[PDB]
Amino acid sequence: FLVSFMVDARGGSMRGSRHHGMRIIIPPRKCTAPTRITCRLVKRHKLANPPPMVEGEGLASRLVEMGPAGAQFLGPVIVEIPHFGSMRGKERELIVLRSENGETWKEHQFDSKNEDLSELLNGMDEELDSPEELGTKRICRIITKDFPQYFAVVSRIKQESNQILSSTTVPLVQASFPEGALTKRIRVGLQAQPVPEETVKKIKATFSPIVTVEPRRRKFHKPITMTIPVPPPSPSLRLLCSITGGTSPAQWEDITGTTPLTFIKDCVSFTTNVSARFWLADCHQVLETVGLASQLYRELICVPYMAKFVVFAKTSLRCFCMTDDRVDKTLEQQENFEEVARSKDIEVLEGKPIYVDCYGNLAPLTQQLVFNFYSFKENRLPFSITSQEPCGRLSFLKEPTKGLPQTAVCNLNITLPAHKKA
């Protein structure tokens, strides 16, 4: 199917012709009646009041209008939707939103998960390998017993949540609420975004994980403990915080003076009374630690995507970075072009422009060249092209410099078809 199909209480195992990965499964005796099931990945621009995102959270897939606005299934059913969010091995997770009428946005979840029982002797059970297999195939399994009008898939950080709380990413990040500091025993989540040194090179002066507590800007009645592991080395140490909540971006400031900084081997324990963003920075210049943080912060909040890199040629080049587009590009196959190199899946930065260098048969015509990658947009990069050498390889890099080697993103080998010259 492309968008829709009918199905009876005999149950249906239908994959989506258009967007590879897409797969609705309705086990037997679970549909109310024969019904029109639908699953269309509507463009983000087209819709209004799209599900709200915060600073550091990221849209994995497009949004998925479903076939029956209110169908209530007897069993459960599965919608496998494919995504392109970079997972980074549990450094980030996928939280699944749902709107009943595309005005109100809520989280969606099912308490009970089983394999052999939901299928009910379905002949092609075909559970997609292990859950880890889904995490590798960039599939998100949604399991519901009623179709909400719109799902979102989203890549947050891990936000281990309870109602004592230490992080599943980094364990020296134990932040536990004390006895009687919350009026209603409410769920609270702890997020723990580390920082690669490799990217600290970008802009010298060190940093620790960015720790956050998910119910934000809510005062805690009794002081709440925190533990954060320290940066390595280059008063020396400044602690930062932002209290801003939800949709708006945060702002940083140094609060070394207003917080007592208790030391334990490898980390720091301290109290606050507000749920907010905490981040450490050992360096011996203090006026810069605000802005040298908010330069780095800008880099960290960008969303990662496992994008394909494809290069199209026709004697003469057009270079593309993309995800979720139909492979058989009509424009190029008609202008008589040839896909010269479609690469593996690669983490790229939804915002950060990406460069291209040429190590090949011929040089580019006639300044350096770049194109900004965005998620779910086609990304145009058009070109102008000893005679002994037949072929050449070009590569894409995130750093432009020639002083130190800043290794590249993708190495691809190309070959002009050469039906004529120019």
């Binding site: 968008v3 829709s4 009876d8 209480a9 005999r10 005796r29 008609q334």
Partner: protein, 289 residues
């Protein structure tokens, strides 16, 4: 030097007229402006039979002006193409928009959910749709192919905005095959609403045939005669033995039916067929005694 004063002046005003900042406003503008461009081009080409006087005068500054005719007819052979483009754009756009609104208008009819209130007329709707299946199917195939090849022509020409025409081509062909699919769904929905009703009305005719039988037995024991007594009874037996042949198709329908539906629906099919088999018992017991 009457030459470089008069002819250089003529091409001086020729350049200004042909060069323009008006590319064409609407569809029927570009056209009635391009007509004017072909007049100007033929007038430049009919200035080739006056440059034999200039060639004669000079032959018996010349390299400065020898180029200006090939340049004003290359500006002609360029801005003719620009005006051609600006027409063809307005055409292709109009075809697209109007076709989207055709896919639009027909989409509504497909997406309608009316599956009737009784057999007879949902069985009508079956036809009243399946016609629209062909009309739309084939007529679409047509409009599609025509517009498709409108694009592929404009591509092979090398129009300025072809890219847009590509994603217009996808933007149409996709929504089309979507339409095709949608009709193929609707169709099936109707087929089921049919069989379901066929069941229902078959009940309404069997519960009635039987609720007649059981009522008409007291009449067949009581006015009377012996010579049309056994004959009438044997004839009723001939009936009932065909009523069984019918109800075998009734039970045998209900079975395949339950498997398609579930829940409130299947729980209602149950009560319908249980109700009619109960009428079977309440006749069956009577016809013994």
């Amino acid at each position: 030097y009457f030459d470089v004063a008069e002819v250089e002046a003529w091409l001086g005003e020729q350049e200004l007229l042909m060069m323009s900042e008006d590319k064409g406003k609407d569809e029927q503008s570009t056209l009635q402006l391009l007509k004017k461009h072909l007049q100007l081009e033929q007038g430049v080409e009919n200035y080739e039979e006056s440059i034999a006087q200039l060639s004669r005068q000079c032959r018996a500054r010349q390299s400065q002006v020898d180029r200006l005719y090939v340049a004003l007819k290359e500006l002609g052979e360029e801005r003719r193409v620009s005006l051609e483009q600006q027409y063809w754009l307005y055409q292709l756009s109009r075809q697209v928009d109007e076709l989207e609104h055709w896919i639009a208008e027909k989409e509504v009819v497909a997406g309608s959910p009316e599956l009737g209130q009784d057999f007879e007329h949902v069985s009508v709707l079956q036809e009243k749709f399946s016609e629209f299946a062909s009309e739309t199917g084939t007529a679409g195939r047509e409009r599609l192919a025509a517009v498709n090849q409108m694009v592929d022509e404009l591509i092979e020409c090398g129009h300025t905005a072809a890219a847009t025409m590509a994603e217009w081509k996808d933007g149409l062909n996709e929504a089309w095959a979507e339409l095709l699919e949608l009709m193929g769904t609707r169709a099936q929905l109707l087929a089921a609403s049919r069989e379901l009703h066929k069941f229902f009305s078959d009940a309404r005719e069997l519960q009635g045939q039987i609720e007649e039988k059981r009522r008409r037995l007291p009449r067949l024991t009581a006015r009377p005669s012996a010579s049309s007594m056994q004959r009438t009874l044997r004839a009723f037996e001939h009936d009932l033995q065909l009523l069984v042949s019918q109800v075998r198709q009734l039970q045998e329908g209900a079975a395949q039916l339950r498997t398609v539906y579930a829940g409130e629906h299947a729980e209602a099919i149950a009560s319908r067929e249980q109700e009619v088999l109960q009428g079977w018992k309440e006749l069956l017991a009577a016809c013994e005694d």
